[PDB]
Amino acid sequence: YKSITIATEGSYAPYNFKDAGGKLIGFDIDLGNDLCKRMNIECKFVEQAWDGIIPSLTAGRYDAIMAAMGIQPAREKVIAFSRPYLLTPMTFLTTADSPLLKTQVAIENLPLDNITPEQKAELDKFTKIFEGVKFGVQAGTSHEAFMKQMMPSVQISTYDTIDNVVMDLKAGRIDASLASVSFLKPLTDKPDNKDLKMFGPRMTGGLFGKGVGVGIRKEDADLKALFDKAIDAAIADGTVQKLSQQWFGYDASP
Numbered sequence: 001y002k003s004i005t006i007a008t009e010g011s012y013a014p015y016n017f018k019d020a021g022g023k024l025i026g027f028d029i030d031l032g033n034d035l036c037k038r039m040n041i042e043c044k045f046v047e048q049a050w051d052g053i054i055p056s057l058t059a060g061r062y063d064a065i066m067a068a069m070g071i072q073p074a075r076e077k078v079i080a081f082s083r084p085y086l087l088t089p090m091t092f093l094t095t096a097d098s099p100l101l102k103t104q105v106a107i108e109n110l111p112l113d114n115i116t117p118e119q120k121a122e123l124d125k126f127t128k129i130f131e132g133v134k135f136g137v138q139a140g141t142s143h144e145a146f147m148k149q150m151m152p153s154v155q156i157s158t159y160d161t162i163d164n165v166v167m168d169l170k171a172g173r174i175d176a177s178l179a180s181v182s183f184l185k186p187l188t189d190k191p192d193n194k195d196l197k198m199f200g201p202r203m204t205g206g207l208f209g210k211g212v213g214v215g216i217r218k219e220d221a222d223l224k225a226l227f228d229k230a231i232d233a234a235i236a237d238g239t240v241q242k243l244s245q246q247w248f249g250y251d252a253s254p
């Protein structure tokens, strides 16, 4: 390896998005360039729509994916992942005036790896509150998978990008959403989004898997080993923690 092409969505702030000039920027872009410097590889970032991000990697259109991608079990069936470069729980989003905000949270930190009758009870409480409530999620995400598998009785609308979800929630076309704390905290910290609030349990595991990793082809064992070495070094020296505070406003490093 001498040069690699890394794909990113280009519409998932603060992980990957476009600045004023249209240049790809964000946590994934900064970390991508840092990791490649540690690996002694030339780094080229390309914009790719979420719909064909995994098949374009397997087809050989580029060598890696750094696009806020959760290491989820369904994805592991198709591609390989590096070591997680960020750890984030999942939570719900609504409006600041929404009665949903008054709901009691019995389990603050909800792991989904092995749902006990008590965790199922907390999940069912929310499902029942969420009936009649219009839900919005980005298509092809772990958010959609959670909603279809864990809360099937809840009506969901799928969107092209997360920016369309945010638009519709602010507009009043949808009542609530789901995404990670890493996306939602920078969003709710913005003064333009004082009308948006995070709520409910903070969920980990199950179909959300463990952390955000680099998407690599399964046969590219050597490229995975290189990224794993680079990621461990970037975490140990505090580079991931620095970029996490710089882009998310808190430490989400493993």
Ligand SMILES: C[C@@H](N[C@@H](Cc1c[nH]cn1)C(=O)O)C(=O)O
Residues within 6 Å of the ligand: 009, 012, 050, 067, 068, 069, 070, 088, 090, 138, 140, 141, 142, 143, 179, 180, 181, 182, 183, 212
């Ligand atoms: C970290 C990020 N992961 C999601 C959503 C996502 C990543 N890129 C575009 N959408 C996923 O892997 O399906 C999130 O939950 O907020």
